[PDB]
């Protein structure tokens, strides 16, 4: 999309990730599984909830009876009343249709941005320790157990702790 | 010694909800909400917790003048609005003009 | 009938917090704005891509 991640360099979504909108997939000796990034997902839920409530709650009306009744010699004001009713209809129909179109595009872009930013955060943490193998995936140059995975998903990855082990494996494999 | 894989991705589900965007029509999304109310209860209810005045077979002229076909109608001390039926025709039984009739209907509406 | 509503329509009352309705342009009460639209659906989730092509 606008940020190139959803339906972009990350081609498809995950049906096996049920606890959030954005997240991770890992695999090591101990197995594999899916986990949502709770921080980014909760921000998106807060933003989208606010976006929905704003579109609805900013419409506050007063008590009003639209209808009017006119006799056979009041045709001009009857048509004037019809013009007012039709004019509001056209304004509200046009604005409502376009607001939905424009906000849907921005919402899909917003989700695309979040997935893009999540990938970039991980890439900035891992640096040389992992290889970008495409499709939003990193393949480590050092074994990364469940505890190591939790550090990445929590943003507490210790690059120097594995930097030398990754360096040796990176330098051999590239020789 | 070289290791494992971590991947970043996003949610998917069995949703068939479709939304329109400015750039593309009929986009399937994992969650959506509807801004347009299109369902009604099919009844004439009480506005402001107050029942309407239902004239039945009479119009406002027949009701307010005391047409013999509306004498059965109950006299309520208040109403939120007035309901007539399209077939309601029992009005001024003696032919004539009801002066400022539409204005009177406005004053008696609530 | 014996029901309560804040928005009344000649073909029946509507109970809603949505800003728009397409029931009937002639309403009494605190009502949504009448529109000609048949569908006003707002995306909240992502584009749904459960499967990809065989590669």
């Amino acid at each position, epitope marked *: 999309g606008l940020f190139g991640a959803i339906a972009g360099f990350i081609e498809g979504g995950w049906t*096996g990730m049920v606890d959030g909108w954005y997240g991770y997939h890992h695999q090591n000796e101990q*197995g*594999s599984g899916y986990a949502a990034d709770l921080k980014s997902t909760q921000n998106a839920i807060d933003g989208i909830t606010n976006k929905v409530n704003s579109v609805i709650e900013k419409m506050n009306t007063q008590f009003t009876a639209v209808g009017k009744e006119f006799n056979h010699l009041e045709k001009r004001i009857e048509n004037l009343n019809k013009k007012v009713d039709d004019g509001f209809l056209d304004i509200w129909t046009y604005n409502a249709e376009l607001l939905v179109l424009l906000e849907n595009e921005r919402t899909l872009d917003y989700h695309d941005s979040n997935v893009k930013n999540l990938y970039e955060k991980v890439r900035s943490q891992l640096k040389n320790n992992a*290889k970008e*193998i495409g499709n939003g995936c990193f393949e480590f140059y050092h074994k990364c157990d469940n505890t190591c995975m939790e550090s990445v998903k929590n943003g507490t990855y210790d690059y120097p702790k594995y930097s030398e082990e990754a360096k040796l494996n990176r330098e051999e*494999i590239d020789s | 010694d070289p290791g494992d*894989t971590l*991947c970043i991705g996003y949610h998917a589900n069995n949703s068939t909800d479709t939304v329109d965007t400015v750039l593309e029509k009929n986009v399937t999304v994992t969650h959506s909400v509807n801004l347009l109310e299109d369902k009604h209860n099919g009844k004439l209810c009480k506005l402001r917790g107050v029942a309407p005045l239902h004239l039945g077979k009479c119009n406002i002229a027949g009701w307010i003048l005391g047409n013999p076909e509306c004498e059965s109608l109950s006299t309520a001390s208040s109403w939120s609005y007035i309901v007539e039926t399209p077939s309601s025709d029992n009005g001024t039984c003696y032919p004539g003009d009801f002066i400022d009739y539409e204005e009177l209907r406005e004053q008696l509406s609530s | 009938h014996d029901c309560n509503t804040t928005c009344q329509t000649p073909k029946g009352a509507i109970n809603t917090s949505l800003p728009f309705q397409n029931i009937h342009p002639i309403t009494i009460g605190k009502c949504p704005k009448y529109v000609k639209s048949t569908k006003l659906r707002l995306a909240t989730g992502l584009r749904n891509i459960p*499967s*990809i092509q065989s590669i």
Partner: antibody
Amino acid sequence: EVQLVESGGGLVQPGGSLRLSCAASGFTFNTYNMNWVRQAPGKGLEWVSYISSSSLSRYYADSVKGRFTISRDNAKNSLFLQMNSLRAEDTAVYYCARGAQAGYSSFFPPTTFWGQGTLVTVSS
Amino acid sequence: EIVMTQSPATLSVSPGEGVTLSCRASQSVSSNLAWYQQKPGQAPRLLIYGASTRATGIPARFSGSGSGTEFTLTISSLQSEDFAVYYCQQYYNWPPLTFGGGTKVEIKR
């Protein structure tokens, strides 16, 4: 068409060594993850080993860890399985299987296409 | 590991009717389940993946559904080339990649 032909199976005494190989054709071998699956005579299917496209990730079943080594030569479209310290229970048909592309794991099952197999017999 | 259970191991049915094979999971595998068909002397062949998606070339009489722990593989009209062994498989949590015992579908006479 996707083709996987494996070879190198035969007879080996217990404690001996054997090197299975698999020839891949009809797809971009250097982008796919690969697997070995074995089937003992009259028994079900047992996954043996996994290797990634880059060869960085290699996984093994508990019953072969330390004895089997999986490898891959992407330039020669070849998959290998080194078997050492072979026991009698290792007698089986060893299948070469193709998984998902690098980065698309768990979008397609890790054994999407299978080769015919090669028979390995471990006895004295 | 995640253990796959395929009970019963043998199903005897006539030729031309509906069969349903079962597979359950020691814990949820979401939709990362696949079905395979093996004939004696031949390699396994993929039929279903994603627990419902059918593989290229697989006839429409094969279908599967399920999520979490319980899954089924249904063949609507059993032809003669469909009498074989069928294994399920999970790829939600692996390694180890676990298959399941397999179910033999046999001609009833």
